[PDB]
């Protein structure tokens, strides 16, 4: 199946999905309230378990300067690729590898907004190990906003360390937690 | 002589302006700037030595809850009072007062966006003062946001305490100089 | 000109006067009231608006502690250090600013005696403003007497707080509001 970027440059553009996810309201959202609280403009973003690309891609349309899209399932790679390719925007690089494993071995280039989508399968209290591990290992600076979209049926994520929590936001049966580095 | 209410609902509409300060440029990039980083609804902002208004009430256009306009000089008082009136927007109140006492005896009501424009005979010092005492007595919370329009000529600003500063601007002969508190 | 301190060990020394307020009883007479209800000796005293010093020099010649003056003007900040150096008498610190960006921004010393006398174009509002911010940022502990020198002819002080006031003294054409932090 395919979906639409929802705003930017590339709004109402076309992107393929991977096989399932498992919304556009969801995605429409999650920009309304970061893009209300940042300017994209400049911003460097990561987008782990990206599936699609879908999130980094809307990012890059409403102006990021970077994107480094982290997934593991090579036929969702490649879709990622063909998406990149598809929109034509610049900024892009994908890190086709165990995400979990890219964000232990870290960086020296920190990132200002993280958007994560886990797969149906990964605990929370492994994504509570990522968001520590986004603070301690080079991804994230003061200022840098995290965004997790969980489906409600899952534990809520346990922030770490230094974040302050955004108001907590639902749609349907989709939840999405939001917080940024002190 | 008159200006114009840059953007927001009241976007275009003329507000009447006192014996003068002395620009359109700078009320226009001072919103463009916060803006991009700070959605202005639902804030809660203060205008010290409001002058015309035109800052605040811009902040009130573009979609602030409330604005505290704090001004000295009597006539200057009974300008903004009419262009409250003339623009219609709910959320204004008018104090008429020595701003740096008012400033002095505080608030329990915090705002997240300090705007102020201080006549050229008030000295950066005393302008420094006023910027320790929004920190202490009340007047902000941890995110707020300060914006000080200095003619260039002046003296640069010491920000106190714990607010982090944003890149220094200047348009002609003007400053703007912005901070938040951490 | 040229006025004399009254008592103490400085009693009856000449001190210069700025460009002028514009008396020896109602100078004699405050410190007459003050010092029957409280002893000098080892106190900390605040003088503000300052002007030739009078007030806060008298305190020194009395036994005080410390004093800090707080004046706006260059002329009259200079004639005040030169009447310090002139008594020869240890404490004194002279803080040239705006008056009420001082109070504003305030202190972790808290003093013993506030003595004002504002000039003519200050109103009782913001004067009464001042009051408040003495008691909340730092100026002020229980016990602290204030003293406010005021023409007949301006409004009465609204005393805040925990503020008891004391009787209520006139002396031809000056009045005296003295008061103490419950």
Redesign the interface.
Same mark, same amino acid.
């Given at each position: 199946s395919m979906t639409r970027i929802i705003g930017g440059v590339a709004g109402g553009r076309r992107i393929a999905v991977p096989p399932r996810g498992t919304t556009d309201r969801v995605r429409e959202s999650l920009f309304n309230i970061v893009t209300? *609280? *940042?300017?994209l403009?400049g911003l460097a973003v990561l987008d782990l378990y990206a599936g699609s690309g879908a999130l980094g891609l809307e990012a890059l349309s409403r102006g990021a300067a970077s994107v480094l899209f982290v997934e593991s399932d090579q036929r969702s790679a490649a879709v990622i690729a063909r998406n990149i390719e598809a929109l034509g925007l610049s900024g892009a690089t994908l890190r086709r590898g165990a995400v979990a494993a890219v964000v232990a071995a870290g960086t020296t280039s920190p990132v200002d907004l993280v958007l994560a989508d886990p797969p149906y399968n990964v605990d929370s209290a492994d994504v509570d190990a990522i968001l520590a591990a986004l603070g301690t290992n080079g991804w994230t600076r003061?200022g840098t906003v995290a965004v997790v979209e969980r489906a409600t049926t899952c534990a809520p994520l346990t922030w770490p360390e230094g974040w302050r929590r955004w108001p907590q936001r639902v749609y349907g049966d989709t939840r999405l937690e939001l917080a940024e580095r002190?």
């Open positions: 209300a *609280r *940042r300017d403009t003061e002190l």
